[PDB]
Design an enzyme around this catalytic site. Sequence first.
Site, short mmCIF file in Angstrom:
data_model
loop_
_atom_site.label_atom_id
_atom_site.label_comp_id
_atom_site.label_asym_id
_atom_site.label_seq_id
_atom_site.Cartn_x
_atom_site.Cartn_y
_atom_site.Cartn_z
CB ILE A 87 18.16 -17.84 60.61
CG1 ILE A 87 17.73 -16.88 59.80
CG2 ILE A 87 16.96 -18.55 61.41
CD1 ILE A 87 18.53 -16.73 58.66
CG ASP A 88 19.48 -18.81 67.83
OD1 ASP A 88 20.31 -19.75 67.73
OD2 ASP A 88 19.26 -18.21 68.71
CB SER A 89 19.65 -23.27 67.54
OG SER A 89 19.33 -22.75 68.77
CB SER A 144 15.02 -18.57 64.59
OG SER A 144 16.79 -18.81 64.28
#
Lengths: 742, 83
Positions: free
Chosen positions: B38-40, B42
Amino acid sequence: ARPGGIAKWIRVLAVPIILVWVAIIAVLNTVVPQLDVVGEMRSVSMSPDDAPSVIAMKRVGEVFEEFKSNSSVMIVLEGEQPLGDEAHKYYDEIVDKLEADPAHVEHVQDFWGDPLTASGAQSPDGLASYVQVYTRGNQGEALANESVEAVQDIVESVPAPPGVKAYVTGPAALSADQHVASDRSVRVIEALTFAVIITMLLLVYRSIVTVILTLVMVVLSLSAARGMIAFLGYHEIIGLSVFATNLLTTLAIAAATDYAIFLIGRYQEARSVGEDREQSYYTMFHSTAHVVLGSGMTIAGATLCLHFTRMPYFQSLGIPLAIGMSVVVLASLTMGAAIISVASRFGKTFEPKRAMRTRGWRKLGAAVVRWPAPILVTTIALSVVGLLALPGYQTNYNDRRYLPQDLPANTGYAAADRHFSQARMNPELLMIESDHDLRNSADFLVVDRIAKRVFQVPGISRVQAITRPQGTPSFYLPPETFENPDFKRGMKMFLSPDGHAVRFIISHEGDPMSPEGIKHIDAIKQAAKEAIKGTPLEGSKIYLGGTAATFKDLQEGANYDLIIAGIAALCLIFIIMLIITRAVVASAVIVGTVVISLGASFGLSVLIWQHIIGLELHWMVLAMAVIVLLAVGADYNLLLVSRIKEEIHAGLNTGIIRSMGGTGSVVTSAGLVFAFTMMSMAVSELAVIAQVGTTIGLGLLFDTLVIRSFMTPSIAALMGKWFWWPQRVRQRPLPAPWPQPV
Amino acid sequence: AATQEEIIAGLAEIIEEVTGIEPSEVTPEKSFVDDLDIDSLSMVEIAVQTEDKYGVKIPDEDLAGLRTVGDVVAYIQKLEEEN
């Protein structure tokens, strides 16, 4: 969603309401001709009957007992060899044929036929000659258009001598040619819009059945709008213009497909969440029908704000667009909802064929919410930098460049420019009405004085009068000159039949129909005013008419009416947003974001058209683009704000982010479709219509990419509690306890 | 003061609302996007949603330093139990 209300009625009566809408389509398209035919046969005038130029020209015709309508067409005789006696015979035959058809030709100024003024009509090199024909019906009207067509047919009927050709041009001919060009380009523009919509819907839905059903929705809604407007125009209930027809067709199709995308996207999102067909349809209605009502109200009111203008083009753009868009929105809300209802039962037609894209939009919403100030500043700067096009923006009125060069009027102007100045083929009529007889020596001294004074006005090249049959001939006329038959003919051609008014033909130096002509009209009027001042004849009227005075009235009315209609559209769209959302701050944010997006749209469109296309922006392009942008961009912002309000129950920031995740794909697809449909006007032969379409398309691309995506949610997250004033909304809700692990 | 299990369950539920990774995957001994993807940005989404619907603040300065769900849950503990 609670299964009841209007949604339930549309659900149960879906098939009957589809049948009723189809019957309405059939009735509206079987008792009234199509929109193009009625627009051609019920076109509105070019300038209002109360305009100073129109009343001036009508007074010209009434006093001189020559014509009764404000419509003039030039007939240019261009020959490879100098116009000899054969050219004179051909021109006389043209004049005789025109006089033989009084139904369409009211008067013909036989300047070239009379030797006394013959050299006045000829070109300086003696290769081209022009004759003015005052036709029937006000310029731009269907009567004037058919008069122009009759004049062209009459000219083409006479066998031209070898090496000599004749062209029909002029303002009324220019309007007829713009109608012809729009009739030529309507098929291709409709085909391009269909192709673009089909391509975008295939890209978005990726389902053949879904795109066919959406296309049925859009085509039937557009047919409803076109049929209703054609019915209104055919029965003379409302005025109509070819601008109105083209813009109405494109706005109807684009807004119908936007409503289709809104409803289908909401339904597919509800289906993807897990709701069955009934609950998904009910949720889609309860969350999008009010949005579509609001969108239709905004578009209809924004166009209706043009109905309160002065010029007949905007007057005929206001009510027809309002009625057409209202019909489109009713057709959407009723028959599109019914189609979704019936197709939901039929297998898996409207079931989404792919997982909806929310992760990207959710991340984007996170970026917007967490740092709303930098995002808002960035988008404000990106939308204001467009306003850098103001120092240099031009609003050329030169309708010649906005029509195809192969049209009869454009070809006539091209032939004229090869031997005449640009102004001499668009002259101006002036006179003074003495209360006494004008056939007196001192009266002709006064006439020569005013002719010299108006000639001395800067920017005026040629003046024609009784004392000056040509551009340029202590003065004194002996009484014996009154009995000269040639002078008597010149008198009858230049003086009023009762000998009380003397007409003057004024030819500018530059473009008569550019702002220079407008600043020339008042100069001519005032100069004639002091020239007649201090004279025994002082006390006369200075009615000055023609294309330059006409465009002066149109430009002043355009400025004032554009300002007032923009303000009215702002107020009305804000009122509608306040009615829907019950939030004054949210409505103000929507309106302001659309205004700044309008600034960016102006910048981008002016840049492209005036700098890389090379064609200066038309004046009505601003008004129509402003109205359509205030409609559509505010509609997108309204959809986003309504979704935010629905999602608020979980919190403000999380509500905004969930709303963005749920509606980003839907709104970006709808905005892309609308913008591309508007840019489909780029192929319209009416370069003014192409400018309108490209401006609106670029504006809506800006609205969806940066304005709706960033500016509105950033303002919403920055404000928070106060974004929904006066509706008492909390911040992030009370902290829920950490749930027991499952 | 909430203990380990309920806070982990709440984070797992918010991940469900975010991506859909099954709740039992989240565990205070595992890692973050180098493991669970899960991205930064995000992470910014997770943090704002947990500020809103759970009423616990997460600053951007401390967000970059959180590279396990154990790290973020520990941050939750020593931000909640301090009155």
